Structures are given as structure tokens and as C-alpha cells.
Amino acid sequence: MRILDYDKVIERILEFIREKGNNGVVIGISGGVDSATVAYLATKALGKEKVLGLIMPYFENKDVEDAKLVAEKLGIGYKVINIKPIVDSFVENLELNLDRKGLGNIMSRTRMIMLYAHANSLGRIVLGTSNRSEFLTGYFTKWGDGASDYAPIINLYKTEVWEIAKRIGVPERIVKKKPSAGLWEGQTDEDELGISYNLLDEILWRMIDLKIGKEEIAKDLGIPLSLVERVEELIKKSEHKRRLPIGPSFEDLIVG
């Protein structure tokens, strides 16, 4: 995988957060490693008084315990907000069936509204916790979690996020935890993507950053071309998630 000079990378992230969130920030803390890493970097960069964490569970599971652990060890201000009543109200108003992915989308978008409502009230910005691995594969809710003012680790692959998390003191059981967006019980990132993040990042790195042909990738890693075509598919089918709403142009229709 590409090699980064973490010492310098971490430094640049901290400087970036200092420059963008001097007036304080609001972050969604879920108990996963991405939001915890952003929570740690933001705290070290601005100091705990400038970091408000919102823990917004839908399910009452151990994930909440992990998030509070992050909040606790950092000493930041935080708030636990049960979003199930609001989420279910969206569903009751829908009056139609909705699969688990659609329901997960409501949860994530509901968290987005909560984050922005708090940031707006406090004159703060919202720090998103998405990473490049999710960004390139479309593994995120459009307009939901992820949607923020600034995203400190959007340009870092998952593998790198884990390395940085360990280096900054993020709880080990969190760093080692199996990745899960937590939209429904039993949801597992690698099972949904059908590949580990380690193997994914190796492909994205070569396919997007290096622009290395599908064939060179498969062999230059001893992996089935299928696995490579798969990844390339996730990227193509999620291109609509990496751009603002588009419409028709009318340049050749201008008159004079």
C-alpha cells in the first residue's frame, strides 16, 4: 500500500482542524473507529472545550458504551440522543414498506439534522467522519452521516485511519473492532462490501491513485480479476454519491 509519513499526516490534520474549527465543532460519535479518531484529533487540535460530541443511538447495544468511552476519555462535552422516536415517526408518516438500507438512511440523515441543529445553535461547524474507502465505494448515506462542513479524514483510506487511531490513543478494542455502520443488527462493512478493507485499499490505491489497469492489479496482487472488477463496479455505481445534484446544460441553446 502507499506509504504515508504519519507523523506529518497527523500534524497536517490537526492544523487543518485548527484553521477550520476555531469557533468549536460538533461531531457525531458512534463508538466506531472513524468518528473516535476524528474526536481524538479534534480534541488534541482544539482542546476539549471546543468539542461537543453527539452520541445518537437508534439501537440499544454496546456501541453506545464504546462511544461514551471515547467521550469520557477525552473529557469533551457530550450528549446522548435517542433518535428512534424521530426515525420511527418518519417511517409512520411514510406508510409504506422500507428495507433496512432505506431505514438506515433515515437514521443517518436524522443524525445529520441533529448535528447541524446543534452546530447552528452554537455557532460551530460540523466535522464529518467519512474516510476515502467509504467515499470511493459509496459506502455511506447520501446527505446523511458524512454530509458535513469539513471532513478531516476523507482523504485517508481505512487502513491508514486504523494506524492513526492507534497512534493517537483511540481505545484499542475500538481500533480492533470489526467495522460496522450500525444501521441494522449484524451489519458488517466487509461482509457488505464482500472484501476486507486491507484488500480494498490496495485496489483503490492502484486503481484510482495510480490508475493501473484491471489486469495489472489482479496479478500485481495475486487476486482474482473478479474481485478487481467487483471493486471497480462499486466505484462506478456510486459515482452519483460523489457529486452535487446535476441538471441539463443549455450553452448551445443560447441566442443573440
From the list a copy of itself, Zn ion, none, partner contacted by residue 254 (C-beta under 5 to 8 A by kind): a copy of itself
Stretch that binds a copy of itself, among 70-78, 110-118, 175-183, 213-221 (CB under 8 A): 110-118
* Category of 54 on φ-ψ map: left (φ > 0), alpha (ψ -120 to 50) or beta: beta
How would you class 154 by CB atoms within 10 Å of its CB: exposed for 0-12, middle for 13-18, buried for 19 or more?
Answer: middle
Indicate which single residue of 73, 77, 84, 86 sits in contact with a copy of itself (rule: CB under 8 A).
86
Q: Which three cell numbers stand for residue 213?
A: 489497469
In angstroms, the CA 35 to CA 41 distance is 10
Task: Give the 3-state secondary structure of 182-223.
Answer: CCCCCCCHHHHHCCCHHHHHHHHHHHHHCCCCHHHHHHCCCC
From the list Zn ion, a copy of itself, none, partner contacted by residue 196 (C-beta under 5 to 8 A by kind): Zn ion
Pick out residues in 10-49 that bind a copy of itself (CB under 8 A): 12-13, 15-16
33 among annotated binding-site residues? yes
Taking the least distance from each CB to a copy of itself, the nearer of 73 and 116 is: 116
Contact 123, 149 (CB under 8 A): no
In angstroms, the CA 112 to CA 76 distance is 20
- DSSP label of 28: E
- Residue 94 found at the interface with Zn ion (CB under 5 A): no
The least distance separating a copy of itself from the CB of residue 74, rounded to whole angstroms, comes to: 20
Nearest to 28 by CA among 46, 48, 53, 47: 53
- Residue 151 found at the interface with a copy of itself (CB under 8 A): yes
Indicate which single residue of 128, 171, 179, 182 sits in contact with a copy of itself (rule: CB under 8 A).
128
194 among annotated binding-site residues? no
In angstroms, the CA 105 to CA 114 distance is 14
142 among annotated binding-site residues? yes
The least distance separating a copy of itself from the CB of residue 114, rounded to whole angstroms, comes to: 7
User: Which stretches of the chain bind a copy of itself, using CB under 8 A?
Assistant: 2-5, 8-9, 12-13, 15-16, 81, 85-86, 89-91, 93-94, 96-99, 101-102, 105-106, 109-110, 112-114, 116-118, 120-122, 128, 130, 142-143, 146-156, 240, 242-250, 253-256
